[PDB]
Amino acid sequence: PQITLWQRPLVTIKIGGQLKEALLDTGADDTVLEEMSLPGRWKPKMIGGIGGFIKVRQYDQILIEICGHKAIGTVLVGPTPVNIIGRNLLTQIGCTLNF
């Protein structure tokens, strides 16, 4: 739908058989979620943010239903304050900025 920026742009994702909410982030190149159980293998990886650098697990080819749309990409799991859906997934569900 159309979403104004008066409140945090929050959205219900379904991931790895579980329900969660997550922040729509056009600032973010990648998708990062707080600590949660996911099947398969991962790779130790590191990202940077405002504060500094954090160390994540990389899962690839993880199916996510964002507000009822399908998408499949790399999801980084770690020590984030917020659930970030960035641009790798944003493009799939067909998202844009209008102003």
Ligand X SMILES: CC(C)[C@@H](c1ccc(Br)cc1)c1c(O)c2ccccc2oc1=O
Q: Is 25 a catalytic residue?
A: yes
From residue 83, how far is each of 34, 98, 99 by CA, in Å?
Answer: 6, 23, 25
Instruction: Say whether residue 84 binds ligand X (CB under 6 A).
Output: yes
In this structure, the chain runs to a length of 99
Instruction: Say whether residue 5 binds a copy of itself (CB under 8 A).
Output: yes
| Sign (positive or negative) of CA dihedral 31, 33, 35, 40 | negative
Angle at 26 between CA 24 and CA 28, to 5 degrees: 95
> Which residues, 13 to 42, sit near a copy of itself by CB under 8 A?
23-29, 32
Instruction: Say whether residue 68 binds a copy of itself (CB under 8 A).
Output: no
Distance of closest approach, residue 44 Cβ to a copy of itself, in angstroms: 16
Instruction: Say whether residue 77 binds a copy of itself (CB under 8 A).
Output: no
Which residues are marked as active site?
A: 25
